[PDB]
Amino acid sequence: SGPVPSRARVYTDVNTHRPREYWDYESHVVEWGNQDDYQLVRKLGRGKYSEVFEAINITNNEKVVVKILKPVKKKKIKREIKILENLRGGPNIITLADIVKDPVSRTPALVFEHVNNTDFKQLYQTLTDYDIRFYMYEILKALDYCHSMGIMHRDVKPHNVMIDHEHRKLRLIDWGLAEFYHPGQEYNVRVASRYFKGPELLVDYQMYDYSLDMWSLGCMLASMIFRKEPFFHGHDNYDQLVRIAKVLGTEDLYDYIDKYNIELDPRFNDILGRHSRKRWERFVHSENQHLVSPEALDFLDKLLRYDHQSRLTAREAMEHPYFYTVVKDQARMG
Ligand SMILES: O=C(O)c1ccc(-c2oc3c(Br)cc(Br)cc3c(=O)c2O)cc1
Ligand SMILES: [Cl-]
Ligand SMILES: [Cl-]
Ligand SMILES: [Cl-]
Numbered sequence: 183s184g185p186v187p188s189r190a191r192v193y194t195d196v197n198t199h200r201p202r203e204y205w206d207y208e209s210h211v212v213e214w215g216n217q218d219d220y221q222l223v224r225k226l227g228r229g230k231y232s233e234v235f236e237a238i239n240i241t242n243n244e245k246v247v248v249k250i251l252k253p254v255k256k257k258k259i260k261r262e263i264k265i266l267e268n269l270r271g272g273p274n275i276i277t278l279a280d281i282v283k284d285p286v287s288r289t290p291a292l293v294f295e296h297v298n299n300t301d302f303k304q305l306y307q308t309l310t311d312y313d314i315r316f317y318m319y320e321i322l323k324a325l326d327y328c329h330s331m332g333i334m335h336r337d338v339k340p341h342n343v344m345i346d347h348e349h350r351k352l353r354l355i356d357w358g359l360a361e362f363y364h365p366g367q368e369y370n371v372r373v374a375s376r377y378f379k380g381p382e383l384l385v386d387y388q389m390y391d392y393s394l395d396m397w398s399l400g401c402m403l404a405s406m407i408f409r410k411e412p413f414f415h416g417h418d419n420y421d422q423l424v425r426i427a428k429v430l431g432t433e434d435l436y437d438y439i440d441k442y443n444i445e446l447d448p449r450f451n452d453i454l455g456r457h458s459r460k461r462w463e464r465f466v467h468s469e470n471q472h473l474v475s476p477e478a479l480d481f482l483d484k485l486l487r488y489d490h491q492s493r494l495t496a497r498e499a500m501e502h503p504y505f506y507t508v509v510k511d512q513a514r515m516g
Contacts, residue, residue: 186442189365190391192495196332197362205332205362207264208257217282220248220293230301230341237293239279246279247294258358259290265333265360266292272331274324276344276355297353298346305345306406311473314406315508317345319500320352321399326496328360329392335360336373338398340405363391374398376422377412381435381488384423385444393490396499400485407478409470420453430488431459438488477504 197205223236226247233250251259266278280293321343328335337359344353359373368388380397382390404413416422427435432454439446462479481504484494
């Protein structure tokens, strides 16, 4: 009888209550700036980021960052720009300063604010227990904000989290896969990187929502406190679900599948087989001991749920005891 419909628990009708021009990016007329205002200085990313440059705005001598976009469809260009513009000014969202196009090649490029970067993938050797809690909370600020603005990021991972550890600042970047949430809409499941894909993507359930981002966040958290990168290390798309199943157990997976009347490939059921749930305690060793706590484990348990509707919202997450002291400390110092 086909899959059972699903709706976001929160922020369900955000885009519905806003004017059409807010979310209808296909009708958005892009107002391009002048590329001549910007001169490229050098390459950024140290070999991990393509077509990202430090640049200078010669109209005010301000240092900026330029990302040159890969040849995708015009529709996806409008989408990213529209979303960045709608989210501009939000807490811990990267700030789009301008958009330009090359005179002759007509190659589009985004101009961002300049922020220092100690790569999140290279920062776990000097990251204490409090540090992980702090930065996780900052990520949640961004996710709660964009969700409340009717937007799913759909590509949450360490690579897309820029961290300036000196000033303890954080920015969520690369909104190229982001989309607007509309209740009842079916979305493409070919999003996110394999290690951070939620179960809904891996079983081809298209009517997902903001909670997708919360799974990805759980994967990041698991990786950092257990010192295992990535935590769910699938070698292909089937193996990704298998390795999730080896931790969460197959019992809750099949219940999830039945709940939304999802139909898997016949061979997939044989592949998944039968696995018991591992207690989160079993991934703790003497070298990740100092990053693990009862509240950390409880928090992780409530993010990594098969059922996307059962996962904590960003706001629910921010009020979890895992952040109790972090919240108190931030509220009296800044
Ligand atoms: O939306 C994007 O795809 C997107 C990519 C890179 C930056 C981006 O990257 C930096 C890197 Br990589 C190194 C250093 Br140092 C600084 C930045 C920076 O300030 C900055 O905005 C921002 C946004
Ligand atoms: Cl989509
Ligand atoms: Cl694994
Ligand atoms: Cl949320």
